[PDB]
Structure formats: C-alpha cells, structure tokens
Amino acid sequence: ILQHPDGTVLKQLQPPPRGPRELEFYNMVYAADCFDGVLLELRKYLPKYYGIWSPPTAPNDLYLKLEDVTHKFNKPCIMDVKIGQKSYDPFASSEKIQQQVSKYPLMEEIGFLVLGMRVYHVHSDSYETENQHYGRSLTKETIKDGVSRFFHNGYCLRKDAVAASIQKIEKILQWFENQKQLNFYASSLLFVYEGSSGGEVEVRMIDFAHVFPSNTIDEGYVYGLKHLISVLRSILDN
C-alpha cells in the first residue's frame, strides 16, 4: 500500500489470478450503471474506489486507486483482521488448502486472524507494531487479550473505541445477513481509531482477491464477525 498525501492510496495488483480478481470485484461493486441494492449498500463499507491507475510512463504497472481510510485521523491506531473460517477459496487445490490452513490452523475454530496492528502510545509519543506472527500465535485462551492490546492507548483501555467497533461491525454483519450473492475468503476488516491526545472509529472491508459468486449466506464470514463481536463485547467487561 502506497500512501499518498491527497488522501488516497495505491494498492498494487497482486500477481494473477489474485490482482485481476480484485480489480474485477471493485469494478463490479462500483459500476456506474449498477442499481443492485446489495452492491450499492456494500459501497458504504469499502474504501471509495477511483478506478484502475498506472504510472504515466508504465501502463504495465497496475494499481487500484483507493480512499485512504486513515486520512482523517491525527495519530491513527490501525488493526487489520482477516475474517472467516476458511482462508482458501472454493477452487483451491489440496496443496493450496493445506498451505492456507497451515498458515493458521485455528481459523476454523476462531473465525478471524489478526494480521497486524499499529498502536499509538501517548506516554512515549510512539507506535508499537505487531506483525503477522503476533496474530498467528493467538489461541482460544489468548485471543481476548490479543485483541485487547489494540485498544491500550491514552493511559487506559479504550472501551469507547471497542464499543464503536462493535456498532460498526454490526452494520457489516447486517449486510451479510441480507445478501446471498457473494462469498468472501481471505478478506479483512481494517479498524482505525484516533490515538492522539472519543467513540470515533473506522471499520472497512478490504482485500478482495478471493470473492466469488454464491447462492448462500457467507456462513464462515458471519461466524467470524459474530465471534469477533463477542470477543470485543467481553473486552467491555474488563
């Protein structure tokens, strides 16, 4: 992701077939002539999409121009959470399924995986970062405290940001409860709150290289969201 000072980002297309699929997804959802109510509602939860972009001298080099969801924040605290029971897609080979399950074999049980976090600490005027191995090390026993870490800012547990996140995720859950046309694998939620010196959160869906047509509820995604909501709710009792 390349952050631009105009409030947008450029996301380089992943190698094929993943990049091309993600392009196709953004093009479908944001089709100017689209009047599908499911897709019009979905736009609210995605970064705004400004089309394919390449450098003036390099039409080979393909990016998505997207809204920078952290732009309105001063000291953004950011967490990326992969959602679902399966991070492989319906056409994955045996090898690929094994590859994906082995990356985090608790995916089926927990239904989400923390990809990373960046947390502003007021006392030190600095950021604490956690990489992909942080989330992959969390179990049923440590997931609550693992998620809690994201909200430790300003000398306190930020229960305002926790509650706002639940409220925002609930709207995304409601969208999933009311569509049976897309299933999302290896997709994420990006959480942002203000770390600088209340209740102000962004939650957006990102990462769409494995979104497929469906005729059922996305049950794995729903499971993950619900479990994430339940974990966040338990953090409100701390």
Kindly list the residues in this chain that would bind ligand IRH in the complex (CB under 6 A).
1, 9, 11, 47, 66-70, 76, 78, 118, 190, 206-207
Residue nearest to ligand IRH (CB): 47
| Residue 129 CB, nearest approach to ligand IRH (Å) | 8
Specify the residue, 65 or 158, whose C-beta has the smaller distance to ligand IRH. 65
Beta carbon nearer to ligand IRH, 205 or 225: 205
Q: Select 11 or 86, whichever has its Cβ closest to ligand IRH.
A: 11
**Which residue number, 24 or 108, has a Cβ lying nearer to ligand IRH?**
24
96 is in an annotated binding site: yes
Ligand-binding site membership of 82 (annotated) = yes
140 three-class SS: coil
- To the question of whether residue 101 is assigned a binding role by annotation, the answer is yes
Please tell me whether 181 is known to bind a ligand: no
Q: How far apart are the first and last CA of the chain?
A: 35
Beta-carbon contacts of residue 172 (< 8 Å; ≥ 6 apart): 45, 189, 203, 205, 225
Query: Do the annotations mark residue 210 as ligand-binding?
Result: yes
| Least distance between ligand IRH and beta carbon 162 (Å) | 19
Query: In whole angstroms, what is the distance from residue 230 CA to residue 114 CA?
Result: 15
Phi, psi of 172 (to 5 degrees): -65, -45
What CA–CA distance (Å, rounded) separates 188 from 202? 13
**How big, in percent rounded to 5, are the helix, strand and coil portions of the chain?**
35, 25, 35
Q: Which is nearer to ligand IRH, 47 or 111 (CB)?
A: 47
Alpha helix segments (H runs only) across the chain: 18-29, 37-42, 94-103, 107-110, 132-136, 143-148, 159-177, 219-235
Residues that constitute the known binding site:
11, 18, 67-69, 80, 82, 96-103, 132, 207, 210
Pick out the residues of the known binding site for ATP.
Answer: 11, 67-69, 80, 207
Residue ranges at the known binding site for substrate: 18, 82, 96-103, 132, 210
